[PDB]
Design an enzyme around this catalytic site. Structure first.
Site, short mmCIF file in Angstrom:
data_model
loop_
_atom_site.label_atom_id
_atom_site.label_comp_id
_atom_site.label_asym_id
_atom_site.label_seq_id
_atom_site.Cartn_x
_atom_site.Cartn_y
_atom_site.Cartn_z
N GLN A 19 -6.88 -35.63 -33.46
CA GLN A 19 -5.64 -35.85 -34.19
C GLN A 19 -5.49 -37.28 -34.74
OE1 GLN A 19 -2.88 -34.56 -30.72
NE2 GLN A 19 -1.66 -36.22 -31.72
N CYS A 25 0.13 -33.18 -32.19
CA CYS A 25 -0.26 -32.27 -31.11
C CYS A 25 0.42 -30.92 -31.24
CB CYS A 25 -0.03 -32.94 -29.74
SG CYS A 25 1.69 -33.43 -29.48
N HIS A 164 3.99 -33.16 -24.87
CA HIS A 164 2.72 -33.03 -25.58
C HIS A 164 2.36 -31.57 -25.73
CE1 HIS A 164 -1.24 -34.24 -26.95
NE2 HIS A 164 -1.81 -33.61 -25.94
N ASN A 184 -6.92 -29.40 -25.92
CA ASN A 184 -6.17 -30.54 -26.39
C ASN A 184 -6.69 -30.85 -27.82
OD1 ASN A 184 -4.46 -32.87 -26.28
ND2 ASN A 184 -5.85 -34.01 -25.05
C1 LIG Z 1 4.66 -37.10 -30.64
C2 LIG Z 1 3.91 -36.23 -29.64
C3 LIG Z 1 3.24 -37.12 -28.58
N1 LIG Z 1 2.77 -36.41 -27.36
C4 LIG Z 1 2.29 -37.23 -26.40
C5 LIG Z 1 2.86 -37.25 -25.14
C6 LIG Z 1 2.40 -38.10 -24.14
C7 LIG Z 1 1.38 -38.99 -24.40
O1 LIG Z 1 1.03 -39.83 -23.36
C8 LIG Z 1 -0.23 -40.43 -23.23
F1 LIG Z 1 -0.35 -41.37 -24.19
F2 LIG Z 1 -0.35 -40.92 -22.02
F3 LIG Z 1 -1.15 -39.49 -23.32
C9 LIG Z 1 0.80 -39.00 -25.68
C10 LIG Z 1 1.27 -38.15 -26.68
N2 LIG Z 1 4.83 -35.32 -29.02
C11 LIG Z 1 5.30 -34.22 -29.65
O2 LIG Z 1 4.96 -33.94 -30.79
C12 LIG Z 1 6.26 -33.33 -28.88
C13 LIG Z 1 5.61 -31.96 -28.59
S1 LIG Z 1 6.36 -31.04 -27.36
O3 LIG Z 1 6.84 -31.99 -26.43
O4 LIG Z 1 5.40 -30.10 -26.89
C14 LIG Z 1 7.62 -30.25 -28.16
C15 LIG Z 1 8.35 -29.28 -27.28
C16 LIG Z 1 7.83 -28.00 -27.13
C17 LIG Z 1 8.49 -27.07 -26.33
C18 LIG Z 1 9.65 -27.45 -25.67
C19 LIG Z 1 10.17 -28.72 -25.81
C20 LIG Z 1 9.52 -29.64 -26.62
N3 LIG Z 1 7.45 -33.13 -29.69
C21 LIG Z 1 8.21 -34.21 -29.90
O5 LIG Z 1 7.90 -35.27 -29.36
N4 LIG Z 1 9.29 -34.20 -30.67
C22 LIG Z 1 9.80 -32.99 -31.30
C23 LIG Z 1 10.39 -33.28 -32.66
O6 LIG Z 1 11.26 -34.43 -32.65
C24 LIG Z 1 10.51 -35.58 -32.27
C25 LIG Z 1 10.10 -35.41 -30.83
CL LIG Z 2 -0.16 -36.58 -29.17
ZN LIG Z 3 1.19 -35.18 -28.14
#
Ligand SMILES: C[C@@H](CNc1ccc(OC(F)(F)F)cc1)NC(=O)[C@H](CS(=O)(=O)Cc1ccccc1)NC(=O)N1CCOCC1
Ligand SMILES: [Cl-]
Ligand SMILES: [Zn+2]
Ligand SMILES: [Zn+2]
Ligand SMILES: [Zn+2]
EC number: 3.4.22.27
Length: 217
Positions: A19, A25, A164, A184
């Protein structure tokens, strides 16, 4: 139900994607789920356009492109739009672009999606065995996730609050330690060729069964 499931063995899972520095994700999870259904419904496996989702499944669907989104509402965009393009025809650029969906390059459709009940690892198992890969959210916000190399992943600091989007493509056990086989989208150098085996039936570990969904062609 089968003791172990691995949809890669049925030709239903594409190569793990990279990605980059885009929080897409959710879009990879969503295309990955629908990729399996394409293969199950048509016998064709074609990587689908995560970029199409990033660019087009936007404000109306609560998604913010490289700043995050939801798998369920990505499926709804595909439903509404009556299609999604192949990855090859609408390639991934790890950034927010203008919507450039072209029905000419449609490679899949989505008619519905199904949301699984919160925390039910048993129902997730059944869905995985009988429906196909399931899009799930996990709590990945831990160095241990980022640094995962191999084995069954367990992080005591995990919560059930997801952040995520990933794809459960199977389940099994490693000499008795049960796991979810998770695809992933951080490249194939993450984990085991881009996969992580996450603890299964260890109290909804990292929220893996908090919010499962799967689409249907
Ligand atoms: C941005 C991305 C990053 N994911 C992530 C999490 C932890 C990480 O930690 C690390 F760096 F340690 F790995 C790295 C990346 N997350 C998402 O896309 C998440 C995906 S999600 O969290 O799967 C969305 C979701 C699905 C089902 C129920 C509740 C929530 N969505 C998100 O952050 N949003 C939704 C739209 O509005 C903005 C916020
Ligand atoms: Cl991510
Ligand atoms: Zn993510
Ligand atoms: Zn956490
Ligand atoms: Zn690879």
């Amino acid at each position: 139900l089968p003791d172990s499931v691995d949809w890669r063995e049925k030709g239903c899972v594409t190569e793990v994607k990279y990605q980059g520095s885009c929080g897409a994700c959710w879009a990879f999870s969503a295309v990955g789920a629908l990729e399996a259904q394409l293969k199950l419904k048509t016998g064709k496996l074609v990587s689908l356009s995560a970029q199409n989702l990033v660019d087009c499944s936007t404000e109306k669907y609560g998604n913010k492109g490289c700043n995050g989104g939801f798998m369920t509402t990505a499926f709804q965009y595909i439903i509404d739009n009556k299609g999604i393009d192949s990855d090859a025809s609408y390639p991934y650029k790890a950034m927010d672009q203008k919507c450039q969906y072209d029905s000419k390059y449609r490679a899949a459709t989505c008619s519905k999606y199904t949301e699984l009940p919160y925390g039910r690892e048993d129902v997730l198992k059944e869905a995985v065995a009988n429906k196909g890969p399931v899009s799930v959210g996990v709590d990945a916000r831990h160095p241990s996730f980022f640094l995962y190399r191999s084995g069954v992943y367990y992080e005591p600091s995990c919560t059930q609050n997801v952040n995520h989007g990933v794809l459960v493509v199977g389940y099994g056990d490693l000499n008795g330690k049960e796991y979810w086989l998770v695809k992933n989208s951080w490249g194939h150098n993450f984990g085991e060729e881009g996969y992580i085996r996450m603890a299964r039936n260890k109290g909804n570990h990292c929220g893996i069964a908090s919010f499962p969904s799967y689409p249907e062609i």
